[PDB]
Structure formats: C-alpha cells, structure tokens
C-alpha cells in the first residue's frame, strides 16, 4: 500500500530500510526457521515480556 498503517507496533528506527527492501524485492527460496529455541536458549532470562 502507498501508506502502510502497520509499520512497527513498537516505535523505532530501522537501519538500511531501502537496502533491505532491495534485498527482499526478489527471492527464489524463502524459508522461516527458529534460529534459537525460545525455552532452551534463555533459562535464566525472562522471555514473556
């Protein structure tokens, strides 16, 4: 959309927005995976925030 109404649900600044748009403008194989387990990686740190 010309005016995206949901950009960031928490306000902030994105570094290299246009570079990431150019990188993600065309893909061949796109896969989503868990880089770090939610419970295993942070035993001593609160993750429910």
């Amino acid at each position: 959309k010309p005016n995206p109404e949901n950009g960031t649900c928490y306000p902030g600044h994105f570094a290299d927005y246009e570079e990431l748009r150019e990188q993600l403008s065309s893909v061949s194989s796109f896969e989503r995976f868990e880089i770090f387990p939610k419970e295993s990686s942070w035993p001593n740190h609160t993750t429910t925030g």
């Binding site: 928490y10 306000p11 902030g12």
Partner: protein, 49 residues
C-alpha cells in the same frame, strides 16, 4: 532505549549496558542511549533495529 533511567533499572537492573554483535564480515558494538522524546504510539522510548 528506555525513556528514563528508572525504567532501565526496573527492567534490566544495570545502570549501564552494552550490546555487541560480531561476525567474520560485519561487527559492531551498540550502546543504549537514555533520553526523553515525544510519544509515538503511546510510548516515549524506542527500540533500534
């Protein structure tokens, strides 16, 4: 980036902190900055991506 140092102490229990990400190609060190700024989406503080 917390809006005030009181929320910083309440959330992370450290008056000062450092964030460092390192790779073979890209390496950088980030330091949080605590300052007041106008509210966007009912949040004074922001998080930098």
């Amino acid at each position: 980036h917390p809006p005030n140092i009181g929320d910083q102490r309440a959330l992370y229990h450290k008056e000062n902190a450092y964030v460092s990400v390192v790779s073979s190609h890209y390496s950088r060190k980030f330091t949080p900055e605590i300052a007041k700024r106008p509210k966007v989406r009912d949040q004074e503080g922001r998080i930098n991506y």
